[PDB]
Design an enzyme around this catalytic site. Structure first.
Site, PDB file in Angstrom:
ATOM      1  N   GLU A   1     -16.567  -9.975  16.173  1.00  0.00           N
ATOM      2  CA  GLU A   1     -17.245 -11.128  15.648  1.00  0.00           C
ATOM      3  C   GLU A   1     -18.762 -11.120  15.601  1.00  0.00           C
ATOM      4  O   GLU A   1     -19.363 -12.002  14.956  1.00  0.00           O
ATOM      5  CB  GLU A   1     -16.826 -12.291  16.603  1.00  0.00           C
ATOM      6  CG  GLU A   1     -16.021 -13.344  15.899  1.00  0.00           C
ATOM      7  CD  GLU A   1     -14.711 -12.997  15.235  1.00  0.00           C
ATOM      8  OE1 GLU A   1     -13.828 -12.331  15.829  1.00  0.00           O
ATOM      9  OE2 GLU A   1     -14.511 -13.425  14.052  1.00  0.00           O
TER      10      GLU A   1
ATOM     11  N   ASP B   1      -9.424 -17.815   6.716  1.00  0.00           N
ATOM     12  CA  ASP B   1      -8.117 -18.356   6.964  1.00  0.00           C
ATOM     13  C   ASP B   1      -6.874 -17.524   6.740  1.00  0.00           C
ATOM     14  O   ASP B   1      -5.871 -17.823   7.413  1.00  0.00           O
ATOM     15  CB  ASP B   1      -7.972 -19.561   5.979  1.00  0.00           C
ATOM     16  CG  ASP B   1      -8.814 -20.763   6.273  1.00  0.00           C
ATOM     17  OD1 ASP B   1      -9.679 -20.810   7.190  1.00  0.00           O
ATOM     18  OD2 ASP B   1      -8.627 -21.774   5.567  1.00  0.00           O
TER      19      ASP B   1
ATOM     20  N   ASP C   1      -2.165 -18.451  10.376  1.00  0.00           N
ATOM     21  CA  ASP C   1      -3.350 -18.293   9.522  1.00  0.00           C
ATOM     22  C   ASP C   1      -4.213 -17.262  10.235  1.00  0.00           C
ATOM     23  O   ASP C   1      -4.230 -17.310  11.477  1.00  0.00           O
ATOM     24  CB  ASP C   1      -4.153 -19.584   9.480  1.00  0.00           C
ATOM     25  CG  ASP C   1      -3.611 -20.777   8.742  1.00  0.00           C
ATOM     26  OD1 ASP C   1      -2.502 -20.825   8.184  1.00  0.00           O
ATOM     27  OD2 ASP C   1      -4.349 -21.785   8.694  1.00  0.00           O
TER      28      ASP C   1
ATOM     29  N   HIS D   1      -7.150 -24.168  14.289  1.00  0.00           N
ATOM     30  CA  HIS D   1      -7.859 -22.904  14.324  1.00  0.00           C
ATOM     31  C   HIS D   1      -8.751 -22.782  15.563  1.00  0.00           C
ATOM     32  O   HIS D   1      -9.361 -23.702  16.131  1.00  0.00           O
ATOM     33  CB  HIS D   1      -8.653 -22.735  13.003  1.00  0.00           C
ATOM     34  CG  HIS D   1      -7.884 -22.610  11.717  1.00  0.00           C
ATOM     35  ND1 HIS D   1      -8.502 -22.741  10.466  1.00  0.00           N
ATOM     36  CD2 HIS D   1      -6.601 -22.332  11.420  1.00  0.00           C
ATOM     37  CE1 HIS D   1      -7.638 -22.585   9.477  1.00  0.00           C
ATOM     38  NE2 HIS D   1      -6.474 -22.323  10.039  1.00  0.00           N
TER      39      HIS D   1
ATOM     40  N   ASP E   1     -11.523 -21.053  15.647  1.00  0.00           N
ATOM     41  CA  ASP E   1     -12.832 -21.097  15.044  1.00  0.00           C
ATOM     42  C   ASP E   1     -13.940 -21.944  15.626  1.00  0.00           C
ATOM     43  O   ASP E   1     -15.101 -21.539  15.554  1.00  0.00           O
ATOM     44  CB  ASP E   1     -12.525 -21.771  13.655  1.00  0.00           C
ATOM     45  CG  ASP E   1     -12.910 -20.795  12.551  1.00  0.00           C
ATOM     46  OD1 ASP E   1     -13.718 -19.898  12.853  1.00  0.00           O
ATOM     47  OD2 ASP E   1     -12.383 -20.976  11.438  1.00  0.00           O
TER      48      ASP E   1
ATOM     49  N   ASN F   1     -18.938 -24.369  14.058  1.00  0.00           N
ATOM     50  CA  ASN F   1     -18.466 -23.265  13.219  1.00  0.00           C
ATOM     51  C   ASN F   1     -19.552 -22.292  12.725  1.00  0.00           C
ATOM     52  O   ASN F   1     -19.679 -21.958  11.516  1.00  0.00           O
ATOM     53  CB  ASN F   1     -17.689 -23.836  12.017  1.00  0.00           C
ATOM     54  CG  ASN F   1     -16.514 -22.959  11.634  1.00  0.00           C
ATOM     55  OD1 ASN F   1     -16.304 -22.512  10.483  1.00  0.00           O
ATOM     56  ND2 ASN F   1     -15.664 -22.664  12.636  1.00  0.00           N
TER      57      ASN F   1
ATOM     58  N   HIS G   1     -18.647 -19.963   9.645  1.00  0.00           N
ATOM     59  CA  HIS G   1     -17.568 -19.017   9.919  1.00  0.00           C
ATOM     60  C   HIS G   1     -16.351 -19.228   9.034  1.00  0.00           C
ATOM     61  O   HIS G   1     -15.857 -18.278   8.417  1.00  0.00           O
ATOM     62  CB  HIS G   1     -17.120 -19.115  11.399  1.00  0.00           C
ATOM     63  CG  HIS G   1     -16.352 -17.919  11.884  1.00  0.00           C
ATOM     64  ND1 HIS G   1     -15.036 -17.990  12.259  1.00  0.00           N
ATOM     65  CD2 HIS G   1     -16.726 -16.628  12.077  1.00  0.00           C
ATOM     66  CE1 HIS G   1     -14.627 -16.813  12.687  1.00  0.00           C
ATOM     67  NE2 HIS G   1     -15.622 -15.955  12.579  1.00  0.00           N
ATOM     68  N   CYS G   2     -15.845 -20.461   8.953  1.00  0.00           N
ATOM     69  CA  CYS G   2     -14.702 -20.737   8.081  1.00  0.00           C
ATOM     70  C   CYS G   2     -14.997 -20.276   6.636  1.00  0.00           C
ATOM     71  O   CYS G   2     -14.202 -19.564   6.033  1.00  0.00           O
ATOM     72  CB  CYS G   2     -14.241 -22.195   8.201  1.00  0.00           C
ATOM     73  SG  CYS G   2     -12.574 -22.354   9.004  1.00  0.00           S
TER      74      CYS G   2
END
EC number: 2.1.4.2
Lengths: 348, 348
Positions: free
Chosen positions: B9, B108, B179, B227, B229, B286, B331-332
């Site tokens: 990440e 996703d 996801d 999520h 996230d 996020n 991020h999403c």
């Protein structure tokens, strides 16, 4: 102890999947079905005989199908059959729309290479969700340690088809597309026929999914227009049966050049019910090897059973009457999920 | 030299995918969208506000989105954007029917673990053909040596959902569903949040697809309903940002217990346009880490930017106005396909 363990076409069969004729149909007219299956008999896709096969053929092959399962059970094999599925239920993506095919040929889009099952990316839009009828079997296999993979689901736009081209060239190469029935398995070596139902990108992709242990051998000079199934039939390590109108000496794959090759006699023409037959007379060769000395052949192929026995191969002659109508012989109509044995390399 | 190479990440971002707001919509009302997304604000799936978001939000976030791409380009990153797709075009399987979502959150349903891309088996029927907008990019990645896999396409019948259960329990465990955004990647260790958008079988499956090198750590005690996230945000090896309303000391995953943890300040409430907000105020968290010392944070989260800077993390504060409406933070709304670096194990 995974339930899916199988390295080749001939070791001793422990568990197979057989498959029904229950709602078999011809999908709605469409570029892909036209380009991969009927653009050699009809003038345009609007002439394809869409619709459900006549009940007589589904009835009669379903009882023939019951006998196959019965005898394999007698032999000690574990027989599994497909789940129920409506084949007329529409399937629709943003790019196209259709109805389904049939669940008579489990071989076609489910590939078992070791402890793994791969849902291949089928050439026909109608077979887009092919594995839906087998969700419960797969789930059980999965819960038992079998690895369970799928190829990316294809876009399958008009550009992947070429109706007007010559045969074995109507499936363009825009994305990995290939039916499992275009692959044949000899342990480490995997033979992959590139034709109207499987492109180069598909074998590119096939390689990455199974890894370095195996070597995929793509073939573009055999004259199969669709599946390798009734063109090259391995029988036991070192002996393969070939289709003489298709494979020859300038044809033969290189890792098979050491195996002894027996030429198929010319077959009996079992009939066809329709306008135009759906399969060439060569489905007569679509035999299923149970163990190295046992194979199932249609009992009307008396030239072919004779020959096989001459080479110390005992046969169990059952009969599939509507093979040229639905397009499936013993091999097309079964999927072997486990054969007793181990992983090896047959190049002599 | 595959174009897809990424182990975590936070390493130095080389190529990302950003994503549009062009035809963003709320799908037609349906058990799955209700169970996984709206069954905590609406009384019944027939109340969900199906329809295209107002033009103002799509116009405004698309220019904001143009700035994000512009600035990452300025940073030397290669920015790729989704292909064109109609999200109102119907998708239809034998079991169900729907319209699509949007292509605003590439994160996703596309997972990049090394040189491989995995199309995950998304919990929402509208995202059944999620990867269609990315066929040409993936095709290019594929032709470059990236391994390209997909999870089996799920049946997703009424049985996989449980509207009425407590949150993080309305997605039953009948088949591998999950996801990509439920997975977070720390090299060898893969954190998998089991919640309303990903079950135990999904992580069972995730493990088999990536193999023994990695160890999937499934988590069912964090309180994320969907999520991971905006609950656990790794920033650089040994430093993770956590959501204080969700994770605590009796929560924290075991391989993360050695990393130093910084608690997120309470965020600013950017607004929401609607009736009921689509995302918790915690999309403020996020953020997207560009390199170990650079992260992009919304510029209205001044408490958060301060703290991050206190721990020697430099920020580039851009703004995504409609984040609580479309439900996506930096991020999403991005997908990193390559970060400079190697595969390691951070347990200290």
């Amino acid at each position: 102890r995974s339930l899916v363990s199988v390295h080749n076409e001939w070791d001793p069969l422990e568990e197979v999947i057989v498959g029904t004729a229950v709602g078999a149909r011809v999908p709605t007219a469409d570029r892909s079905v036209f380009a991969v299956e009927y653009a050699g008999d009809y003038e345009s896709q609007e002439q394809i005989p869409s619709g459900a096969y006549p009940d007589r053929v589904l009835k009669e092959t379903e009882e023939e199908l019951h006998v196959l399962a019965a005898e394999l059970t007698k032999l000690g094999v574990t027989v599994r059959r497909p789940g129920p599925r409506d084949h007329s239920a529409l399937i629709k993506t943003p790019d196209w729309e259709t109805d389904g095919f049939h669940d008579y040929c489990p071989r076609d889009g489910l590939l078992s290479v070791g402890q793994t099952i791969i849902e291949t990316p089928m050439a026909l839009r109608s077979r887009f969700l092919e594995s839906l009828a087998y969700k419960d079997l797969l789930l059980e296999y999965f819960a038992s340690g079998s690895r369970w993979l799928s190829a990316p689901k294809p876009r399958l736009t008009d550009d992947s088809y070429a109706p007007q081209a010559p045969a074995g060239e109507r499936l363009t190469d825009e994305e990995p597309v290939f039916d499992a029935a275009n692959v044949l398995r000899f342990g480490t070596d995997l033979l992959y026929l590139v034709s109207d139902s499987g492109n180069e990108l598909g074998a590119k992709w096939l390689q990455s999914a199974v890894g370095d242990t195996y070597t995929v051998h793509p073939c573009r000079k055999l004259y199969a227009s669709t599946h390798v199934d009734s063109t090259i039939v391995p029988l036991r390590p070192g002996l393969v049966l070939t289709n003489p109108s298709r494979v020859n000496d300038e044809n033969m794959p290189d890792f098979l050049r050491s195996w002894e090759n027996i030429t198929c006699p010319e077959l009996v023409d079992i009939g066809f019910t329709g306008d135009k037959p759906h399969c060439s007379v060569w489905i007569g060769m679509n035999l299923l090897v149970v163990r190295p000395d046992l194979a199932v052949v249609d009992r009307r192929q008396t030239a072919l059973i004779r020959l096989l026995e001459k080479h110390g191969m005992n046969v169990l002659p059952l009969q599939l009457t509507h093979s040229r109508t639905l397009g499936g012989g013993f091999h097309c109509a079964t999927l072997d999920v486990r054969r007793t044995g181990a992983l090896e390399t047959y190049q002599f």
